[PDB]
Design a protein around this ligand. Structure first.
Ligand SMILES: NC(=O)C1=CN([C@@H]2O[C@H](COP(=O)(O)OP(=O)(O)OC[C@H]3O[C@@H](n4cnc5c(N)ncnc54)[C@H](OP(=O)(O)O)[C@@H]3O)[C@@H](O)[C@H]2O)C=CC1
Ligand code: SF4
Ligand code: SF4
Ligand SMILES: [Zn+2]
Lengths: 114, 48, 126, 290, 373, 94, 176, 111, 95, 208
C-alpha cells in the first residue's frame, strides 16, 4: 500500500507544523481585533481559537493533519490580509443561540432528535 | 389613434375623474383599462 | 516510490466541514431499492442506494407547504457494489445500516403444467 | 387548543414556535429588541402602531415571511385595540412617552392606556399578559413620572389581576436614552447610586417569562449586577468617550433616587444569566472623534 | 463603484505592483442545480449563465444534446437558428461597444445603439414572448416557429442598421481623443495568447487566424459568404475595429440568410425527443403518451461524456456534458471565455496604470455572470 | 418627417447621409398584424407504409466507444494540416 | 477568407502629412463629431409617453399566470400535476382531491410569483391549456405575502378577462 | 518576410541555416537516446523528412507551401519547443514499461 | 352564491372555514379574503343534458383542438347517464 | 436513417484511431486507455504520474501541437477507490481535433500543478481546489474563488447536499449579518423519475 505523502514523515513533523501554525494564530489575533473594530476581548477569541485546535484532536493520518495545516494557513493569510470582513470573523464565533442542550428532558420538550 | 406619427405614438388613452371614486383626474395608473382596449392599445392588433 | 505511507482508515469529516451534530445524529441506510410493484420492470435494480433517515417536516403556517430544517434530507447516493458502499460509509464517518439484496427466485412453469390430466393444477378458465 | 399552535420541530426562522404575541408600542427601542428576539424564535407577532409606515417598515424585515403583521390603533378608542387582540395568545404592554406633549401629558397615558387595554384583554381572555414599568416607581414625592407608573401598576394589579407587572432598572443598548444623554452634554456633582442592566438579557428574561408558566401574578424586577456610583459612571463614560428634550423632569429622573428591593426576584432567579457593563459598553462607545 | 467585482490592487504610485481580481462575489450554483434536474428543465440555466447572448448559448446547449444524441436538426430550423445566432452576435457586440463607451465616458452612442437594441428586443418579443430570456431552442430543433410578417421587418432593420453603424463609425472610430485613450494598451504575445488560453476576439485581435466557424463549421455556416477580421497588433483600438467588422459581416450573413430561407419544416420528426404539435396530440393516442412521458420523465440519453464549443461573441463557449444513461445529466461544466479572458489580467495590466486597467477590463467583453460557473 | 425643409437641410448638412430617406422611425412599413392564419407542413415523416421507427432510429445508433491499448511511413497527425486561409475579395485592407 | 485591418502607413507625401498636421493644429474632426451630434439633435425623439401610450407587445407575451374555465362550464383544470412536474423552479404546488360528484379536481394550487421565472412551459405543457400566461405586466405589489397566488386568486384573475386570453389563443393556436 | 501578422513575433532575414542548425541539434539530442525506443524512430523519421524538405530548397514562399506551419518563424519556434521536450525527455524515461495499472473497475463508465 | 361562517366570513367552495381558536382569522383582519364569488359545481346542474340517439359518442368541448382531447363515451346504461371526465356534462341516448 | 440522423465522419474516426494508437504505442509508461467515441472525439485515460510529462509532450512534439486548453474538470464519482477525474481538454490549432485527457485521482494524493506548462490552468486549478479538494502540490496560489471565505466544505461533492448548512440574515441585536443553520420554507420536492425497462440495450453492463 505505497501511498504518496504530502509534506511530512509521521505525525511528529505534523505536530511541528501545527505548532508553528498555532504560534502564528496566537500572535496574529491582536492585530485583527485591533483592526476590525471588534466586540470581544482578546483572551476570549484566543480561547475559542485554541478550542478549535482542540476540536480535531483525534486525527492520526499525516496527510489529513498536513491538509488541516494548509487550511489554517490559507485562513490565516486571508485574515492577515483585509480580504475578509466583520461578518466572517463574527461568523467564527457562535453567539446566535440556539442554546439547545444535551439534556434529555430538554431534548424531550423540543424533540424528535435522535 | 393617429397614423401620421411613428410606431408607438399610435394609440393613447385619456382617463376620467372618479371612475371608481379615487380622484383619478390626477394620479392615473395602468390597469385602469378594460380588457379589449388592453389588447388594442398595446399594439397587438389592428382593430379598434 | 515506496514513500511515507501509513496503513489506517479515513476520517474525512474533519475535511468536509460538516457539523458533527449531523454526523453523530443521523444514520445512513444502504439498500437495493425494491421494485415499484405496480409496474413490472427490473431495470430499477442493479444499484445500491444510500439514503438517510426521514426527519421532522412541519407545515408552513402561511401557505400549507412542507418545511424542514433538514439539510441532509433529500440526498440519495447511487452505488454499484455493496463492498465500496460500506467502505464509503465507513470512510465518511457517519454510522450506517446495511440491508440485504433479495433476488427473484427462479421457478418452473409450463403451459403443459397448466393443462395436466389428473393434477389439480388447472386454469379452468382460458 | 387547535393545532398549528404547538411548537413544530426545531426553533427559529419559520420553525414554528408556540406563542402569538400581540405587542403594544414596539416602535420603541426595547420593543424593537423584543420583536427581534421573537423573530429569532420565529413566533407570530402582531404589532399595531400609529406612526408613519416608515418606522414599522424598517423594523419589518427582521420578521420572517409574513410572520409579523402591522395594524393600527389610536390613543383613545377601545375598538381598534379590541380588534388588535381578537385572536391573541399573549399580549404585552410596552408603551410610554417620557415627556408631556400638547395632546398627551403624563396623565391618561399611564392612567388610561393600561386600564383600557387590560380591560379589553380580560374581556378577550388572554393569558400571560405582561406590563412593563420602571423600577423604584413609588407614590412618594418629586416624580410625576414614577407616581404615574405606580398608579398604573396599581391599575394592572386591580383590573385584570392575573397579569405580570415587570420593572427593569436603567437599561442600556445601541440606542440607549441615557448613554446618548450623557454623550449629548455641553452637569452636576451630587451623591447617587445607580445600577444599569444590559438590554438583551432583560428581553431574554421577558420572553422566558412569557413562554414559561409559573410566573403569572408575580411582579419581577431587573438588577444591574454591580450597582455602582453615579459619579464613577459619569467619569467612566467620560474617560471611555475620550473627550477630556432635556427637561427638568428628565434630569431629576436620572439624578434623584435609585435603590434595590428584596421582595421580588432579579435575573438568575428567573433562569437567565446577567452580563455586566464593561464588554457591551466598550462595544457601544464608538463615535469618539474623526 | 459599478462595473461588480472585488479587485485588490497592490501598487507603487499610480503604476502597479500586482493586481488580482477577487471574483466569487457572484456564485449561484448552476452546475449543482443542473445536476439535480432534467435536460429540458435545466435549459434556462444555459439561457442565462451568459445573459447578454440569449440565443448563442441556447444554440450551444442544443448542439451539445444533439451531438450526444445523434439527431440532425431539420434544415429550416438550422437556417432560423443561424439567423438568430447572428442577430445575437450583433446584439452582444453592440452592447460591448456601448458599455465600453459609457465605462470610459462617451455618453450618447450608448443610448443610440440601445434604441437599436430595443428594436431587436421587439423582434425577440414577437418571436418568443420573452423580453430577453427567450428559451425557444429545444434540443432537436426550434420550438414554435416564427409568425408571418417578420422577414421584411428584419430586412428594413438591416438597411437602417447598416446606416446606423456607419454613423457610429462617423462619431467614434477616427475620433481623436478615443484613439489617444487607446493606442498601445494591452499587449498580447501570441505565446501568451495560447498559454493563457484567451479565445475568440482576443485571438481574432492579436495574431492567429483562428475561427471556429471556419475551422469546424458546426452547422450550415459553410454556405454563407463572409470573412472574419484578423487583428494586427496587441491593442484594443484594433480589437474594436475587428468587433465592428464582425458586426458588419453578421449583417451580410443575415442578408444571405434571408435570401436562402427554405420552406421545409419546424422541428424534428422524432416524437420521442421533440414533443408533437398540439392538434395531433389531442387527436392521437401515441402523441398523448409521448407528450406525457416526455414532459414527466424527459427523454433518455445514451451514456458518455461529450464536449462541444461554439462562437459566443466572447469566444470559445464550451459546454461539457457528462450523461449517465438516464433522463438526467450527471455533470455539466461551462468553459467560459470571460473566465479565460479574466485569467490573463496580470499580463494585460503589468505595465500600465489603473485608469487604463479599467479600460482593459472594459474593452474585453466581460459580464461576470459567465465568469461565474 | 413632419418638419420643414430648412432644419431638414441643416440635418443633411450636419451629416450627408440622406437623412430623410432612412429615418429610424417607421410609419406604415410594418407588416400588418392579425395576419391570415397559417398552415404548417409536416416534414420527412407522416407518409405511411414505409416509415418504421426501427428504420429511422436516430436514438439507438449510439455505440459504446471503441477501446484500444490498456516499414512504417507513420507518425501521422490527428488530421490533415488545415488549408491556410486567403485574402478575401470584397475590399480587404488592403 | 479574412480581412485584417490597420493597413495604412502615414503617407510621407507632403499633401497627406500637411493635411494630418492641419487636422491636429486646427481641431477638425472634433468639429465633425459635433456636427454628427447636432444631426441627431435636430431629429425627432422615439419616446412614447408611457402612462398614456403603452409600448408595443406581441400576441405571445407571458404575463399573469391566469386560469381558464370552459364555455358555460367549470374549471378547465384537471389537477394531473404536469405543470408541477415540468415547473423548473418548482413553483407550482398542487394538492388534489375529487369532489363528491366524481370528477377529479384540486384542493390547493399555488404559484410562487417570486420563484416564477416565466418560461411558458406550464402553458406549453398543460394538455388542455388550463393555466395560461396572461397578457398584462402589472403585478407591482407592496407586500411579500401578496405575491403568492392561490387558486381563488387565479380564478378571480382569469375571470377578470376571458375574451383577451381567448382572442390571443385563437390568434395563436396554430404556431404552437 | 516583412512585418508578419503576429504581435510579439518579429521576422528574421536568414531563416534557412538557422532552422537547419536547429534540426541538426534535434538529430543530435535525439542521438543521445537509446535506439530500441520507437519514439526515437518516429521523431528521427519526421525530422529527416522535414530536413530533406528544407536542405533541398533555398526557396522561402515555396518552403512555406511545402512545409506546413505558416508562415516561417513559427516553424522555428515549434522546433525550439520540440528541442525543449527533447532535453526534458533525456530524463523521465518514457519508454519504460507500464506504471501500475488501475484496479480495473474504474474506466467502466455507466456505473 | 356562497355561504357564511357563524362568525360572519365568506366561506369558499372548499369547506375550509375556521375555528375561534385560530390566527389565520387574525391575518384576515382588515384585509379582504378574496374568495371566488362564482362557484364551479353550480353551473353544471343548470346545463341541459345533451341527448343524442346514438350508442357511442364523441366529445371535444368547445371548438376543435381548443379544449380537452376527444373522448368516446358509452351510453348503454340507462339510469346511469354517461359523464365526460373532462367536460362534466352528461348525455342520454334516445329510443 | 437517411433523414433526421446526424451523419458521422468515418474519415475522422480512422484518423483519430490511428493517432491514438500512435500515442499509446509511443508512450507505454502511462497510457491505459485510448478510446474513440462514436461521435469522434479522442479520449486518453491516464495514470496520475505522467501529468507533467504527457503535457510537455502534448504541448510540443510538432506532430500534435495542441496549444489550446479547455476544461480541467473533476467529476465526482463514488464507488471507486480513486474517486475524482481530472479532465484536461486539449485543442490543436493547426489540426482541428479535440482530445480529452482523463487522468484519475483520489481524495488525498495530489496531482502536480499544470500551471508550469499551461498558464491557462491556473485559475482552473484554484477553482477545482476550492470546489472539490484535489490537492495541487508545487503550485504557487491555492486560495478560495467562487465561495465565501467563511464558507467551507467543498460543495461540488455529491456528499455535500443541495442546500448548504449555513444561511444568512440580518439582525439588529448584534447589528450585523449573521449565519444561522438552514431553515427551508419549502421542501425542494425531489422527483423519483428513472423509469425501468432498459432504454439502451447496447450499454447493458454485465451482471455479477
Ligand atoms: N429609561 C428608559 O428608557 C426606560 C424605559 N422603560 C419603559 O420603556 C418604555 C420606553 O422605552 P423606549 O423604547 O426607550 O421609548 P419609547 O418612547 O420609544 O417607547 C414607547 C413607544 O410607544 C409609543 N407611544 C407612547 N405613548 C404613546 C401614545 N400616547 N400614543 C401612541 N403611541 C405612543 C411611542 O411612540 P409612537 O406612537 O410613535 O410609536 C414608542 O413607539 C416606557 O414605557 C418606559 O416606562 C423602562 C425602563 C427604562
Ligand atoms: S394546470 Fe394543466 S398541467 Fe397543471 S395540473 Fe391543471 S390540468 Fe394539469
Ligand atoms: S412559467 Fe415556468 S417557473 Fe413559471 S409556473 Fe410556469 S413552468 Fe413554473
Ligand atoms: Zn368531454
Amino acid at each position: 500500500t505505497s501511498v504518496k505523502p504530502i509534506f511530512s514523515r509521521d505525525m511528529n513533523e505534523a505536530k511541528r507544523r501545527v505548532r508553528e501554525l498555532y504560534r502564528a494564530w496566537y500572535r496574529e489575533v491582536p492585530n485583527t481585533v485591533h483592526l476590525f473594530q471588534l466586540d470581544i476581548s482578546v483572551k476570549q477569541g484566543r480561547d475559542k481559537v485554541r478550542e478549535m485546535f482542540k476540536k480535531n484532536a483525534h486525527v492520526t493520518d499525516p496527510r489529513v493533519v498536513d491538509l488541516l495545516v494548509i487550511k489554517g494557513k490559507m485562513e490565516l493569510e486571508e485574515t492577515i490580509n483585509v480580504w475578509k470582513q466583520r461578518t466572517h470573523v463574527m461568523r467564527f464565533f457562535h453567539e446566535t443561540e440556539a442554546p439547545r442542550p444535551k439534556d434529555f428532558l430538554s431534548k424531550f420538550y423540543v424533540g424528535h432528535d435522535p | 389613434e393617429d397614423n401620421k406619427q411613428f410606431f408607438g405614438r399610435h394609440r393613447w388613452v385619456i382617463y376620467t375623474t372618479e371612475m371608481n371614486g379615487k380622484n383619478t383626474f390626477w394620479d392615473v395608473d395602468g390597469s385602469m383599462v378594460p380588457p379589449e382596449w388592453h389588447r388594442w392599445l398595446h399594439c397587438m392588433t389592428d382593430d379598434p | 516510490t515506496q514513500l511515507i505511507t501509513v496503513d489506517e482508515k479515513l476520517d474525512i469529516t474533519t475535511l468536509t466541514g460538516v457539523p458533527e451534530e449531523h454526523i453523530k445524529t443521523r444514520k445512513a441506510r444502504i439498500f437495493v431499492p425494491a421494485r415499484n410493484n405496480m409496474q413490472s420492470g427490473v431495470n430499477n435494480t442493479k444499484k445500491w442506494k444510500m439514503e438517510f433517515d426521514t426527519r421532522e417536516r412541519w407545515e408552513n403556517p402561511l401557505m400549507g407547504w412542507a418545511s424542514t430544517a433538514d439539510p441532509l434530507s433529500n440526498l440519495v447516493l447511487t452505488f454499484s457494489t455493496k463492498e465500496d458502499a460500506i467502505a464509503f460509509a465507513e470512510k465518511n464517518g457517519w454510522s450506517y445500516d446495511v440491508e440485504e439484496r433479495k433476488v427473484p427466485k427462479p421457478k418452473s412453469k409450463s403451459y403443459g403444467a397448466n393443462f395436466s390430466w389428473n393434477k389439480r393444477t388447472r386454469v379452468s378458465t382460458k | 387548543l387547535h393545532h398549528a399552535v404547538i411548537p413544530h420541530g426545531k426553533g427559529g426562522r419559520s420553525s414554528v414556535s408556540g406563542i402569538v404575541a400581540t405587542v403594544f408600542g414596539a416602535t420603541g427601542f426595547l420593543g424593537r429588541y423584543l420583536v427581534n428576539h421573537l423573530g429569532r424564535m420565529g413566533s407570530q407577532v402582531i404589532v399595531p402602531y400609529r406612526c408613519e409606515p416608515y418606522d414599522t417598515m424598517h423594523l419589518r424585515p427582521m420578521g420572517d415571511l409574513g410572520q409579523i403583521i402591522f395594524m393600527d390603533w389610536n390613543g383613545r378608542d377601545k375598538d381598534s385595540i379590541r380588534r388588535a387582540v381578537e385572536h391573541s395568545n399573549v399580549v404585552i404592554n410596552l408603551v410610554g412617552r417620557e415627556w408631556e406633549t400638547k395632546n398627551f401629558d403624563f396623565e391618561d397615558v399611564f392612567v388610561k392606556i393600561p386600564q383600557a387595554i387590560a380591560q379589553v384583554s380580560k374581556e378577550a381572555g388572554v393569558e400571560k399578559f405582561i406590563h412593563i414599568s420602571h423600577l423604584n416607581a413609588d407614590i412618594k414625592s418629586s416624580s410625576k413620572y414614577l407616581r404615574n407608573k405606580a398608579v398604573g401598576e396599581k391599575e394592572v394589579r386591580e383590573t385584570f389581576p392575573e397579569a405580570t407587572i415587570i420593572k427593569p432598572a436603567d437599561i442600556f443598548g445601541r440606542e440607549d436614552r441615557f448613554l446618548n444623554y450623557f454623550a449629548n452634554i455641553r452637569s452636576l456633582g451630587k451623591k447617587t447610586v445607580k445600577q444599569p442592566v444590559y438590554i438583551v438579557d432583560v428581553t431574554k428574561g421577558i420572553i422566558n417569562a412569557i413562554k414559561d408558566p409559573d410566573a403569572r401574578g408575580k411582579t419581577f424586577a431587573f438588577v444591574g449586577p454591580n450597582r455602582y456610583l453615579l459619579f464613577d459612571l459619569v467619569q467612566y463614560v467620560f474617560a471611555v468617550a475620550h473627550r477630556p428634550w432635556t427637561t427638568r423632569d428628565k434630569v431629576e429622573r436620572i439624578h434623584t433616587t435609585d435603590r434595590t428591593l428584596p421582595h421580588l426576584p432579579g435575573l438568575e432567579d428567573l433562569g437567565v444569566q446577567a452580563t455586566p457593563l464593561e464588554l457591551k459598553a466598550i462595544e457601544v462607545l464608538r463615535r469618539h472623534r474623526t | 463603484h459599478p462595473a461588480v467585482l472585488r479587485l485588490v490592487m497592490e501598487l507603487s504610485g499610480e503604476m502597479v505592483r500586482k493586481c488580482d481580481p477577487h471574483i466569487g462575489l457572484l456564485h449561484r450554483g448552476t452546475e449543482k442545480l443542473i445536476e439535480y434536474k432534467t435536460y429540458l428543465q435545466a435549459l434556462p440555466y444555459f439561457d442565462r449563465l451568459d445573459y447578454v447572448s440569449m440565443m448563442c448559448n441556447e444554440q450551444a446547449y442544443s448542439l451539445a444534446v444533439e451531438k450526444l444524441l445523434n439527431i440532425q436538426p431539420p434544415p429550416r430550423a438550422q437556417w432560423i437558428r443561424v439567423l438568430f445566432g447572428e442577430i445575437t452576435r450583433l446584439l452582444n457586440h453592440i452592447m460591448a461597444v456601448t458599455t465600453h463607451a459609457l465605462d470610459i465616458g462617451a455618453m450618447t452612442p450608448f443610448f443610440w445603439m440601445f434604441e437599436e437594441r430595443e428594436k431587436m428586443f421587439e423582434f425577440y418579443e414577437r418571436v418568443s414572448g420573452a423580453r430577453m430570456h427567450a428559451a425557444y431552442v429545444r434540443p432537436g430543433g426550434v420550438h414554435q416557429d416564427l409568425p408571418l410578417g417578420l422577414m421584411d421587418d428584419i430586412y428594413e432593420f438591416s438597411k437602417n442598421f447598416s446606416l446606423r453603424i456607419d454613423e457610429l463609425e462617423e462619431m467614434l472610430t477616427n475620433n481623436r481623443i478615443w484613439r489617444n485613450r487607446t493606442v498601445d494598451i494591452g499587449v498580447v504575445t501570441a505565446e501568451d495568447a495560447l498559454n493563457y488560453g484567451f479565445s475568440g476576439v482576443m485571438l481574432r485581435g492579436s495574431g492567429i487566424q483562428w475561427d471556429l466557424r471556419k475551422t469546424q463549421p458546426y452547422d450550415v455556416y459553410d454556405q454563407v459568404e463572409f470573412d472574419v477580421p484578423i487583428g494586427s497588433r496587441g491593442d484594443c483600438y484594433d480589437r474594436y475595429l475587428c468587433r465592428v467588422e464582425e458586426m458588419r459581416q453578421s449583417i451580410r450573413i443575415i442578408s444571405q440568410c434571408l435570401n436562402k430561407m427554405p420552406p421545409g419544416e419546424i422541428k424534428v420528426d422524432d416524437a420521442k425527443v421533440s414533443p408533437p404539435k398540439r392538434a395531433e396530440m389531442k387527436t392521437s393516442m401515441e402523441s398523448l403518451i409521448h407528450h406525457f412521458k416526455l414532459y414527466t420523465e424527459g427523454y433518455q440519453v445514451p451514456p458518455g461524456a461529450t464536449y462541444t464549443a461554439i462562437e459566443a461573441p466572447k469566444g470559445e463557449f464550451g459546454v461539457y456534458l457528462v450523461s449517465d444513461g438516464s433522463s438526467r445529466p450527471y455533470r455539466c461544466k461551462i468553459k467560459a471565455p470571460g473566465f479565460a479572458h479574466l485569467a490573463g489580467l496580470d499580463k494585460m495590466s503589468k505595465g500600465h496604470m489603473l485608469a487604463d486597467v479599467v479600460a482593459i477590463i472594459g474593452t474585453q467583453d466581460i459580464v461576470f455572470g459567465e465568469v461565474d460557473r | 418627417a413632419s418638419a420643414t425643409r430648412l432644419i431638414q437641410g441643416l440635418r443633411n448638412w450636419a451629416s450627408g447621409r440622406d437623412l430623410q430617406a432612412k429615418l429610424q422611425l417607421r410609419y406604415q412599413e410594418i407588416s400588418k398584424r392579425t395576419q391570415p392564419p397559417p398552415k404548417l407542413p409536416v416534414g420527412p415523416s407522416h407518409r405511411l407504409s414505409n416509415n418504421y421507427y426501427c428504420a429511422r432510429d436516430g436514438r439507438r445508433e449510439a455505440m459504446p466507444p471503441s477501446i484500444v491499448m490498456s516499414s512504417e511511413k507513420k507518425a501521422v497527425s490527428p488530421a490533415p494540416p488545415i488549408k491556410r486561409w486567403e485574402l478575401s475579395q470584397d475590399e480587404p485592407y488592403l | 477568407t479574412y480581412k485584417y485591418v490597420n493597413l495604412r502607413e502615414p503617407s510621407m507625401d507632403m499633401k497627406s502629412v500637411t493635411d494630418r498636421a492641419a487636422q491636429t493644429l486646427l481641431w477638425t474632426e472634433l468639429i465633425r463629431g459635433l456636427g454628427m451630434t447636432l444631426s441627431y439633435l435636430f431629429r425627432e425623439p422615439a419616446t412614447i409617453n408611457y402612462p398614456f401610450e403603452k409600448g408595443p407587445l406581441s400576441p405571445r407575451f407571458r404575463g399573469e399566470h391566469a386560469l381558464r374555465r370552459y364555455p358555460s362550464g367549470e374549471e378547465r383544470c384537471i389537477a394531473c400535476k404536469l405543470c408541477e412536474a415540468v415547473c423548473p423552479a418548482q413553483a407550482i404546488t398542487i394538492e388534489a382531491e375529487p369532489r363528491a360528484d366524481g370528477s377529479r379536481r384540486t384542493t390547493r394550487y399555488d404559484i410562487d410569483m417570486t420563484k416564477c421565472i416565466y418560461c411558458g412551459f406550464c402553458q406549453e405543457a398543460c394538455p388542455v391549456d388550463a393555466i395560461v400566461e396572461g397578457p398584462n405586466f402589472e403585478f407591482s405589489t407592496e407586500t411579500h405575502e401578496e405575491l403568492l397566488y392561490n387558486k381563488e386568486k387565479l380564478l378571480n384573475n382569469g375571470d377578470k378577462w376571458e375574451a383577451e386570453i381567448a382572442a390571443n389563443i385563437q390568434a395563436d393556436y396554430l404556431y404552437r | 518576410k516583412k512585418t508578419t501578422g503576429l504581435v510579439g513575433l518579429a521576422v528574421c532575414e536568414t531563416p534557412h541555416e538557422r532552422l537547419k542548425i536547429l534540426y541538426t541539434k534535434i538529430l543530435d539530442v535525439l542521438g543521445h537516446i537509446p535506439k530500441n525506443a520507437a519514439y526515437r524512430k518516429y521523431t528521427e523519421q519526421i525530422t529527416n523528412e522535414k530536413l530533406s524538405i528544407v536542405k533541398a530548397e533555398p526557396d522561402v514562399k515555396k518552403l512555406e507551401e511545402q512545409l506546413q506551419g505558416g508562415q516561417i518563424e513559427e516553424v522555428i519556434l515549434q522546433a525550439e519547443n520540440e528541442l525543449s521536450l527533447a532535453r526534458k525527455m533525456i530524463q523521465w524515461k518514457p519508454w519504460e514499461p507500464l506504471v501500475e495499472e488501475p484496479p480495473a473497475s474504474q474506466w467502466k463508465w455507466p456505473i | 352564491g356562497v355561504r357564511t361562517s357563524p362568525t360572519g366570513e365568506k366561506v369558499t367552495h372548499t369547506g375550509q372555514v375556521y375555528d375561534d381558536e385560530d390566527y389565520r382569522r387574525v391575518r384576515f383582519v382588515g384585509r379582504q379574503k378574496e374568495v371566488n364569488e362564482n362557484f364551479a359545481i353550480d353551473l353544471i346542474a343548470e346545463q341541459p343534458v345533451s341527448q343524442v340517439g346514438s350508442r357511442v359518442i364523441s366529445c371535444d368541448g368547445g371548438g376543435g383542438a381548443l379544449g380537452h382531447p376527444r373522448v368516446y363515451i358509452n351510453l348503454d346504461k340507462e339510469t346511469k347517464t354517461g359523464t365526460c371526465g373532462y367536460c362534466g356534462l352528461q348525455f342520454r341516448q334516445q329510443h | 436513417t437517411r433523414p433526421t440522423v446526424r451523419p458521422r465522419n468515418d474519415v475522422a474516426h480512422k484518423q483519430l484511431s490511428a493517432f491514438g494508437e500512435y500515442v499509446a504505442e509511443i508512450l507505454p509508461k502511462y497510457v491505459q486507455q485510448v478510446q474513440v467515441s462514436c461521435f469522434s472525439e479522442l479520449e486518453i485515460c491516464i495514470h496520475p504520474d505522467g501529468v507533467i510529462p504527457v503535457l510537455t509532450f502534448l504541448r510540443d512534439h510538432s506532430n500534435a501541437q495542441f496549444k489550446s486548453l479547455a476544461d480541467l474538470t473533476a467529476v465526482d464519482i463514488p464507488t471507486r477507490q480513486n474517486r475524482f477525474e481530472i479532465v484536461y481538454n486539449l485543442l490543436s490549432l493547426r489540426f482541428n481535433s479535440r482530445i480529452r485527457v482523463k487522468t484519475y485521482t483520489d481524495e488525498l494524493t495530489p496531482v502536480e500543478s499544470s500551471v508550469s506548462v499551461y498558464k491557462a490552468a491556473n485559475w482552473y486549478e484554484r477553482e477545482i481546489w476550492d470546489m472539490f479538494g484535489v490537492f495541487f502540490a508545487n503550485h504557487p496560489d491555492l486560495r478560495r474563488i467562487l465561495t465565501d471565505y467563511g464558507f467551507e466544505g467543498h460543495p461540488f461533492r455529491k456528499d455535500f447536499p443541495l442546500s448548504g448548512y449555513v444561511e444568512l440574515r440580518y439582525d439588529d441585536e448584534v447589528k450585523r449579518v449573521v449565519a444561522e443553520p438552514v431553515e427551508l420554507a419549502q421542501e425542494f420536492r425531489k422527483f423519483d423519475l428513472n423509469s425501468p425497462w432498459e432504454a439502451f440495450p447496447a450499454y447493458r453492463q454485465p451482471p455479477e
